[PDB]
Amino acid sequence: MKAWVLKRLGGPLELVDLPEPEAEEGEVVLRVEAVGLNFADHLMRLGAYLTRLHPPFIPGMEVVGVVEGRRYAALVPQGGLAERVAVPKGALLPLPEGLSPEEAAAFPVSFLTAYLALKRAQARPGEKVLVQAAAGALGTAAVQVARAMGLRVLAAASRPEKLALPLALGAEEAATYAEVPERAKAWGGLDLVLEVRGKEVEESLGLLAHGGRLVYIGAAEAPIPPLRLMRRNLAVLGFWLTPLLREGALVEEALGFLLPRLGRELRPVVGPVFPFAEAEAAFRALLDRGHTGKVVVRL
Amino acid sequence: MKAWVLKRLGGPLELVDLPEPEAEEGEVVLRVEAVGLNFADHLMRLGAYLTRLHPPFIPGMEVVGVVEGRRYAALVPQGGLAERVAVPKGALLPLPEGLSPEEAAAFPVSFLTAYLALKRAQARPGEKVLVQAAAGALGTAAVQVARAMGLRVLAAASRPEKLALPLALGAEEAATYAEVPERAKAWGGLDLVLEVRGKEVEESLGLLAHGGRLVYIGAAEAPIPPLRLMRRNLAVLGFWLTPLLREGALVEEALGFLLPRLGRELRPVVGPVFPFAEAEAAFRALLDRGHTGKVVVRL
Numbered sequence: 001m002k003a004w005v006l007k008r009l010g011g012p013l014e015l016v017d018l019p020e021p022e023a024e025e026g027e028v029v030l031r032v033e034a035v036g037l038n039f040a041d042h043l044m045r046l047g048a049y050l051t052r053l054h055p056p057f058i059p060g061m062e063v064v065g066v067v068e069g070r071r072y073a074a075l076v077p078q079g080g081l082a083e084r085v086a087v088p089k090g091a092l093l094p095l096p097e098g099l100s101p102e103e104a105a106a107f108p109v110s111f112l113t114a115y116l117a118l119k120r121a122q123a124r125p126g127e128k129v130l131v132q133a134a135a136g137a138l139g140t141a142a143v144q145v146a147r148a149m150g151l152r153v154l155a156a157a158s159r160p161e162k163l164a165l166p167l168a169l170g171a172e173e174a175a176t177y178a179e180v181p182e183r184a185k186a187w188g189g190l191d192l193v194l195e196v197r198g199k200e201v202e203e204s205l206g207l208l209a210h211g212g213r214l215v216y217i218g219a220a221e222a223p224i225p226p227l228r229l230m231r232r233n234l235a236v237l238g239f240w241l242t243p244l245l246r247e248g249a250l251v252e253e254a255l256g257f258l259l260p261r262l263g264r265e266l267r268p269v270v271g272p273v274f275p276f277a278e279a280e281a282a283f284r285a286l287l288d289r290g291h292t293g294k295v296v297v298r299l
Numbered sequence: 300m301k302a303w304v305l306k307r308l309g310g311p312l313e314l315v316d317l318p319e320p321e322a323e324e325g326e327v328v329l330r331v332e333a334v335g336l337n338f339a340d341h342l343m344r345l346g347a348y349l350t351r352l353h354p355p356f357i358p359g360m361e362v363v364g365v366v367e368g369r370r371y372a373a374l375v376p377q378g379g380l381a382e383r384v385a386v387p388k389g390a391l392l393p394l395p396e397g398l399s400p401e402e403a404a405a406f407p408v409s410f411l412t413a414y415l416a417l418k419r420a421q422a423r424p425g426e427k428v429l430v431q432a433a434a435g436a437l438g439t440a441a442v443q444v445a446r447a448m449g450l451r452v453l454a455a456a457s458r459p460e461k462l463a464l465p466l467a468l469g470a471e472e473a474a475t476y477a478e479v480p481e482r483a484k485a486w487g488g489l490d491l492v493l494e495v496r497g498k499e500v501e502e503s504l505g506l507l508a509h510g511g512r513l514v515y516i517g518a519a520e521a522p523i524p525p526l527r528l529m530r531r532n533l534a535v536l537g538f539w540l541t542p543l544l545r546e547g548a549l550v551e552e553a554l555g556f557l558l559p560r561l562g563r564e565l566r567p568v569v570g571p572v573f574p575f576a577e578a579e580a581a582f583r584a585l586l587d588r589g590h591t592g593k594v595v596v597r598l
């Protein structure tokens with residue numbers, strides 16, 4: 001089978017021929033159709049992700065493919081950008097009939113992250129939540145899931161032209177980063193903040209209302225002075241999806257809320273779609289702050 | 300006052316100084332803040348609109364400005380691209396508090412057109428409607444209004460990258476023109492079609508289910524063989540907003556449904572916003588098939 005391999009951190013991807021995957025007991029080999037790219041994939045190539053993968057390896061953790069006729073979505077540690085991948089049957093996500101490969105590849109990571117982050121921050125119906133990078137994969141998902149949980153969503157992005165999408169998905173208001181503080185004052189403070197920037201975390205805590213909680217989801221772009229936290233009984237939550245995945249209960253509850261809605265109230269925003277042969281281009285797209293939606297590679 | 304004048308059809312706009320408008324009994328002079336541009340404005344410059352305006356004149360029919368403190372939206376025959384305009388008090392649209400000038404300028408024409416076109420075609424809750432140019436001013440409005448009336452919306456645009464917005468506003472499915480027929484077959488035919496293209500009208504009637512009606516809203520891009528109509532009891536409706544405006548009952552009913560929702564379930568999509576001095580650039584934007592949303596000039 002053909003597959004892209006990363007032989008050295010910081011190096012280039014090499015499209016090579018490899019042996020067909022072997023399925024151990026409890027596993028199935030699925031024929032890959034689409035792979036959704038994540039910022040984590042980028043951090044992994046540089047050797048900067050929370051989990052340090054040892055080269056050589058096959059990039060891609062979010063796959064969508066076919067198993068004896070049925071199409072699935074699954075999160076694998078690696079081996080995504082290949083024609084075939086072995087997957088523990090118990091990790092397979094069922095999909096609604098018709099759901100496209102491109103739309104399925106933009107679901108797992110973004111929606112599970114959005115839901116778990118809000119659940120962990122105990123988001124209650126009615127609360128105000130600020131979603132940053134609101135026009136991206138994780139952002140566009142969060143907006144929908146937040147609306148599905150009945151929260152008021154204040155969307156933020158780095159460019160004015162990216163604000164229309166979030167506003168269309170349900171954001172009550174939308175603003176560029178420079179204008180967030182003002183919208184924050186008008187809203188009377190935020191109950192929740194999904195931090196994917198990381199550079200202005202302190203400035204973020206200043207937007208929180210009493211008992212507000214900031215979920216630290218990423219530092220894609222600094223300390224947090226424990227004291228500003230006390231005055232308003234604020235909370236900061238570090239967050240990383242991977243570990244959570246190994247918790248049946250959580251996963252179950254999460255899917256119990258997401259799957260029934262997948263394709264209905266929750267629709268993943270597909271962004272740039274690249275052919276298998278343009279994997280490097282797709283990776284670059286991840287870094288293009290002009291793009292919106294999920295970057296997807298189609299086989 | 301400063302104002303842009305069109306002295307010759309097909310000619311350029313000239314930014315000139317003119318006398319302050321005079322308010323006759325029943326009128327008010329409002330201080331313009333934003334003017335929304337329409338395709339009709341473009342057709343008028345070339346002398347191709349249903350209503351033939353005689354030069355010289357001031358382009359702009361959709362204004363938003365202030366009157367003794369209160370901000371309004373109003374449809375005037377001309378005089379939009381000027382610092383001030385006289386308007387019959389009875390034509391003034393009230394706006395929800397806070398509604399931005401740019402967002403108010405994208406409401407009147409698009410939403411009234413979308414609503415009246417659907418009402419005239421007797422769109423009933425549950426029916427399937429195909430909205431073309433679904434990522435533009437008239438398109439993005441129609442999608443929302445259709446959803447507000449409970450219809451299933453199949454959105455169509457000329458480019459793949461424009462489909463995300465419509466899908467986000469509520470479109471059940473979205474497709475590029477070339478792929479419409481197929482989606483049409485899967486849906487089992489369309490009950491309604493808002494035709495803004497005009498070039499493929501025949502091909503459009505073939506997408507209609509029994510008793511379906513096609514609303515002819517524009518020919519922005521050919522005859523309609525009366526016989527294909529009979530076999531399925533289809534209907535074709537010519538449509539032009541202007542005349543309708545002179546009908547209190549209609550206008551009243553229309554606003555009675557739109558205003559309460561303006562800013563809530565109905566949010567105008569603001570697109571390219573140009574400064575007063577770039578009026579010509581804004582006009583060009585109207586013709587750029589890359590743009591999405593309402594073209595707006597801000598004073």
Ligand SMILES: NC(=O)C1=CN([C@@H]2O[C@H](COP(=O)(O)OP(=O)(O)OC[C@H]3O[C@@H](n4cnc5c(N)ncnc54)[C@H](OP(=O)(O)O)[C@@H]3O)[C@@H](O)[C@H]2O)C=CC1
Binds near residue numbers: 133240289291
């Ligand atoms: N903790 C976890 O387990 C998880 C964390 N994430 C985090 O999501 C973020 C990106 O996710 P995906 O990659 O899913 O995202 P998206 O598609 O959201 O892309 C990232 C977006 O982040 C915003 N951003 C702000 N600053 C930068 C910057 N300096 N460089 C690049 N992007 C920037 C940009 O939007 P704009 O232009 O509007 O600012 C950009 O489009 C990362 O921080 C990633 O680590 C995602 C899943 C799980």
Ligand SMILES: NC(=O)C1=CN([C@@H]2O[C@H](COP(=O)(O)OP(=O)(O)OC[C@H]3O[C@@H](n4cnc5c(N)ncnc54)[C@H](OP(=O)(O)O)[C@@H]3O)[C@@H](O)[C@H]2O)C=CC1
Binds near residue numbers: 409
């Ligand atoms: N009958 C009436 O009284 C009214 C008619 N209209 C009609 O709406 C249409 C445009 O409205 P506004 O101007 O409000 O629209 P938008 O912002 O919708 O712009 C027009 C859109 O129409 C689509 N289109 C298809 N072919 C062309 C073409 N050859 N040239 C330019 N655009 C094209 C394009 O979208 P894409 O790239 O996705 O194809 C484009 O963005 C016109 O046909 C206008 O006459 C509007 C209000 C009232």
